[PDB]
Symmetry: D3
């Protein structure tokens, strides 16, 4: 229980992430859409951390093509990394047969007091990714 922001990298994801975040027990302060620009994405994350949200979910920008800069945007902001979250989403993704989730370069970790998690872009990856993530997020905001 806390409050959370969504960041779509340009999607149908924003309303859906809002919904699943809602069911996980989160107030969704809003949806911010940004381009696959490392600076535009980093600016959006940093701004959110400073603003004191408990949780920031990004969606998209985690595949292999050079336009996919979500991870490297994110890494500058992380005080500590939570591979546990990255591994659980990827593991879960493959199991379900969702490959962009299986192969995601998304990070997870803590910036200030905020948990940041990068989820992959496809609808399947958002569903499976929130299902898995929501519990783990809850436990971490608990510190």
């Amino acid at each position: 229980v806390g409050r959370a922001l969504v960041i779509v990298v340009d999607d149908h994801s924003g309303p859906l992430v809002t919904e699943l975040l809602g069911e996980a027990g989160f107030v969704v302060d809003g949806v911010v859409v940004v381009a696959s620009d490392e600076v535009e994405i980093r600016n959006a994350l940093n701004t959110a951390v400073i603003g004191g949200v408990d949780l920031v979910v990004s969606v998209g920008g985690t595949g292999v093509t050079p336009r996919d800069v979500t991870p490297e945007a994110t890494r500058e902001l992380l005080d500590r990394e939570l591979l546990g979250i990255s591994e659980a989403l990827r593991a879960s993704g493959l199991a379900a047969g969702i490959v962009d989730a299986g192969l995601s370069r998304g990070l997870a970790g803590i910036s200030g007091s905020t948990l940041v998690v990068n989820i992959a872009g496809s609808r399947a990856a958002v569903r499976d990714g929130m299902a898995t993530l929501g519990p783990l997020a809850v436990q971490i905001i608990g510190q």
Copy 2:
């Protein structure tokens, strides 16, 4: 597209407070490429479920999906209602589901007594009632059903 489906919501309160499962199953079956022909609500009652099921198979459907009544209490009797209808168990479905659920921490999906099988030419699958379990089972079921209804 892929096919048609009928959704049975096994719940006493729903049979008549508001159905949440039924819309949700429909939304998710839609993304997998199914049209839901209908949502039938029914009490945790062995016969009522068996009839609902039997009627769906009889009717023009490729996929039947029950939600609820898969637990352990006296009144969870969806598996009992479902067994005679099967011609051939699909244990990999029950297992894929039970395992996905457990992996995700959803003990009612994880511990579901729910079955899976062909009843004639129709895929029947029982799913557990919790929202988490509907969301996970469907994510797991959709591709599996897509490939079973194709080999038929």
Copy 3:
């Protein structure tokens, strides 16, 4: 106190040598919130196992965990001593255990033919006999048995 438990240890040696599995099951069960009322040692004989199991369900206990006699040899007869008194099979417990065991490298847990199920209002689970299988089974069983006792 989440509920009470009886332990049945299925081992010839023990029946005819000191019991290692039973104190262990009890430690592990008591971490998951259970109190073990007793350990009952029996031999790998269909009849003995079944009588002990029925006497447990007749003791009214919340959980009965057998240990041993789930393998393939002709004397591993725990599963068939147990089937007759289940009103409902709980495959997802049996599947969870074998899956967990298999992933830990514990082949006897991995391939156990041990059943799980409800007998009246009593949860009944059969676990393989190695110390490894006992330790991994109870970790995996503890939570599931807590929730099922919700009933």
Copy 4:
């Protein structure tokens, strides 16, 4: 090393065309430490399959592996063929294979209705028919060596 095995290929095409699975199964059974007595081929028929399984249990072999006939189509009768012959079901084998195949994205392994168990003193295991399913099935099946150990 470990024991002797016989391979039954279930495939109409092959029973009427070069067998693809038989040599592969033999190959992998070898790496797992089995001598293969050889490959019986068999049309996708309940009774014909059943008798080849019978023949093999009676014929003394430690492991019988079936390939194919595990799907949902009507001619997929290998499970029906196999069940009257088991004295003891080993669901944890069926379970492991299914779980492994589905984990690897192999849907005919993942959903296979193939059975596994002990008939007399023989380990019998039905594996699904696709090439991917054979490789994953056999790499998972080690469980074989354990079980023949007793």
Copy 5:
């Protein structure tokens, strides 16, 4: 049978880690207790490595809180990292419902010829971790 181990507890777990390493095939030379202080931990690990023990298991200090510094303390000691061990423990943890193991920032790796492994603090994590780690440790101690 197989090798010598040292337990570092970051402040219950000591006797338990001892018991389970035992069953895994490991003599336990000692149990060192340490106070959640990057410096203290790194030194206990230094000492453990320098004395040539085969396996060092640390317990605790792997969560997200300010004073969870066990990973920071271990990183510079690792010659080679072994994510497969960390992955196996985290995945095992998660499957078993044990979130502290599931989300543990704990590392695994080789320092000198010593296998070092950070396990999370909860009793369940120690049990799940040790059951998983045991055979992995045995195999690595073989190839070293």
Copy 6:
């Protein structure tokens, strides 16, 4: 054709004379996964030599390089260190899947492999462990993942 693949076999004994049992098998399995195999390069378990073979294979433009061996934990196992120099981006997900699949199947060298996966230039590079069991399990898990990576890169 999904693409071209190259096999690098990292094994001192193979390098110093002995028959290569790993290289043909990876050729077959890549065949089935959908790849034409440009050939097999054998290398000793030396970081330079290995780095040089990967670097040459990348610049030559194959879609996929699989290496075999040198992922363990002896001093000699330097495939990861060689590979790391060359990666523009890591696909931790591929390594996680191979380790996870290995462990489940009881194949501990796959389980514990320090293998990397990643993108070098426009080449998918993946280190697999050297055991015969690890090569079979590795290629099975990898084949489809690599199909989907080549396609995102074209």
